[PDB]
Amino acid sequence: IKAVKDTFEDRAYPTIFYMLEAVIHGNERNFCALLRLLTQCIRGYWEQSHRVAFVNNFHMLMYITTYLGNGELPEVCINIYRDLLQHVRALRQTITDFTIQGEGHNGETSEALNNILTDDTFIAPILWDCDALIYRDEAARDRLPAIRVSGRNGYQALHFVDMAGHNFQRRDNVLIHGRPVIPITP
């Protein structure tokens, strides 16, 4: 804990890796192709400083931990990740068995009133795909959706754009879904 606190307080982590991860998060095929270089880069980073990092990408962390099933790296960062996952699982188990459910008028409300985070009404730090918004809209049966994006009642929905649609002279245009490798589907 103190090691990661010192690493965070050192203020020596470049943002180029974070930007690259954010760019590649929307392409599963590209991420799989670049994993070969990513493993070498993380091995070099560990050799330079065994202190753990890259805690802002839970999906990437779980993917690399599941892929690194051979044992090519020492069980230090992997051990810390496993301990954190075990603690999270224990907290989830205590939350689930410390309360009861079953009562409901027209939707799921017990967990929403208990912890809030289970329901989709709670906000999120950064949104990546439209599947979360679709799930929130589907689960918001008892709540009227007051969508007021830039004063418009409805929000624009479109798929990924091609290479000829990279014009920067557009206003109020969202970028959802994508082409990792097709209609809109979560």
């Binding site: 954010a22 670049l34 906000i123 730090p125 949104l127 994006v149 290479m163």
Partner: protein, 144 residues
Amino acid sequence: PADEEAPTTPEDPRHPLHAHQLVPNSLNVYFHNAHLTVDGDALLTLQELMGDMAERTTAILVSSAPDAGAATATTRNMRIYDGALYHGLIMMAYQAYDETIATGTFFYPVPVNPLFACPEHLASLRGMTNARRVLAKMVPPIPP
């Protein structure tokens, strides 16, 4: 090269990217920052990844109407608002007086929800010495 290979470390003149194709100026800083071990497969994967380009970043503001059946009709004043951001990152390392990033060139402040704020990142725009500095120092404005 076809049916050939070169060491990753820059210690052999036979490496295509050792001294001839390294080029000065623009590539020097990038090489110093990310002089990791790369090869033909890594270059090909990077080139394939570079073919996907986005357009820009935008923010989405939405709201949800709660159950309007507490007192009578729709006379309640209870509302809940939700925030959402597209193409964003979480940064926890703030430089003190680094000159790598200028004022309003690469990184700029963005509105955040009034749940867990920080004054260190809100002052990255600079541009203030005494008046606006002491103004932003005491009161941190939360966006309406």
